[PDB]
Design a binder for this molecule. Structure first.
Ligand SMILES: C[N+]1(C)[C@@H]2C[C@@H](OC(=O)C(O)(c3cccs3)c3cccs3)C[C@H]1[C@@H]1O[C@@H]12
Length: 429
């Protein structure tokens, strides 16, 4: 009992670390405009969940464990639980909101990336806490009054309707296993597709955007972002090819959605072209994200056949000789047709940076995700297990899993700072 008490305070240490880390997140974000963004906004929400959970749950938990008994009675037990599950819930749903956000950033450039603000983010988050609360709290508090009696004996506290290992299983899957799988899906997708954002802003600048058919600087009929319709001067040809392309009668006009989807089609085709080609591929392998994106610009413009006839240049681009590549490109007919765009692309080649386009080059999601899964799944697996054998799990293991579920909330700020040097230097001060 003496050694037990001596070790008990460790938990307190962890709770303190949690509350200060989170409190730091909050303050640092509020006091530094740099840190204000949509993504950082969601990260603020998370740090909040972790704070409310670290100043309340971790502690009263430490208490309950220490005493071996529940002192504060029924209602304290109810509020503690409700705050706890509503909170951690809002934490999972917050993670989801994040993943889906970055996803809609990659896949829906015009519809999503373009209109997204910290206001919209705020709304989404608030709505999330709403959902969480409305799922857990009413159940946890009002289950007794509903059923008419209180299953819970005084002295030991837990959620009334969760007695059964099955309903607990199903609710863990729904509330954990499902959302985790989905976060993994969205994740690996984002991790595969991250560059489409940069290459998007790139082609966006170079080409520009128009919803209704307009004449190119060359005069050719062209629609959307960088989508060429036809070089024939007859408007009918263009409009018709376009219609083929959309699968509707466009009447010369298209929606922003249709547009973003067209772009995506185009880029995927560009890339697929670079990888199908014997020339562009190997070179394209040795290129860093910037330059590579440049290559995808040229290919997105002239086509694979087109960009493959640059062999004089390709040679040096693969050999990491830049100034010579650029020099080799300036002398071609490409540069002659539309010098500005090409000049931007080439500069992008030489420098290896987006500064020509003034462009800002997935982050932290790995960390947060990993922490979450690895501090939760022990417990969820322990539940899945308890479903099938009654006595195989002693209360100890439950408590431990719980603690992990906390050290998530502890570790999340840590992952914040460790991932972004911004949060580092902001905390230091
Ligand atoms: C440590 N917790 C506070 C407790 C145990 C863990 O719980 C979870 O991981 C669960 O999947 C479930 C646990 C038990 C039945 S369903 C969730 C609960 C609430 C939203 S998702 C994590 C959090 C959560 O509040 C519970």
């Amino acid at each position: 009992i003496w050694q037990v008490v001596f070790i008990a305070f460790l938990t307190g240490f962890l709770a303190l670390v949690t509350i200060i880390g989170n409190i730091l997140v909050i303050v640092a974000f509020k006091v530094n405009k740099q840190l204000k963004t949509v993504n950082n906004y969601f990260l603020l929400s998370l740090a909040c969940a972790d704070l409310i959970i670290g100043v309340i749950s971790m502690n009263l938990f430490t208490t309950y464990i220490i005493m071996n008994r529940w002192a504060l009675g029924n209602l304290a037990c109810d509020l503690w639980l409700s705050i706890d599950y509503v909170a951690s819930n809002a934490s999972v749903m917050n993670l989801l909101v994040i993943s889906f956000d970055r996803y809609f950033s990659i896949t829906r450039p015009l519809t999503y990336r373009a209109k997204r603000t910290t206001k919209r983010a705020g709304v989404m988050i608030g709505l999330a806490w709403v959902i969480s609360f409305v799922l857990w709290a009413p159940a946890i508090l009002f289950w007794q009054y509903f059923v008419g009696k209180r299953t819970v004996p005084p002295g030991e506290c837990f959620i009334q309707f969760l007695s059964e290992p099955t309903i607990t299983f199903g609710t863990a899957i729904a509330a954990f296993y499902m959302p985790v799988t989905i976060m993994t899906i969205l994740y690996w997708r984002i991790y595969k597709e991250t560059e489409k954002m940069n290459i998007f802003e790139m082609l966006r600048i170079d080409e520009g955007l128009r919803l209704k058919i307009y004449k190119d600087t060359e005069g050719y009929y062209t629609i959307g972002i960088g989508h060429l319709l036809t070089k024939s001067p007859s408007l009918n040809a263009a409009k018709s090819e376009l219609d083929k392309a959309i699968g509707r009668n466009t009447n010369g006009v298209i929606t922003k959605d249709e547009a973003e989807k067209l772009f995506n089609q185009d880029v995927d085709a560009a890339v697929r072209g670079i990888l199908r080609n014997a020339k562009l591929k190997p070179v394209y392998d040795s290129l860093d994200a910037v330059r590579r994106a440049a290559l995808i610009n040229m290919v997105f413009q002239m086509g694979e056949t087109g960009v493959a006839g640059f062999t004089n240049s390709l040679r040096m681009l693969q050999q990491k000789r830049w100034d010579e590549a650029a020099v080799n490109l300036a002398k071609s007919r490409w540069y002659n047709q539309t010098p500005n765009r090409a000049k931007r692309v080439i500069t992008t080649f030489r420098t290896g940076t987006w500064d020509a386009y003034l462009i800002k080059e997935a982050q932290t999601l790995s960390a947060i995700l990993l922490a979450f899964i690895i501090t939760w799944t022990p417990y969820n697996i322990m539940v899945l297990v308890n479903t099938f054998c009654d006595s195989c799990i002693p209360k100890t293991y439950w408590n431990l899993g719980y603690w992990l579920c906390y050290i998530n909330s502890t570790v999340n700020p840590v992952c914040y700072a460790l991932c972004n040097k911004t949060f580092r230097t902001t905390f230091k001060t």
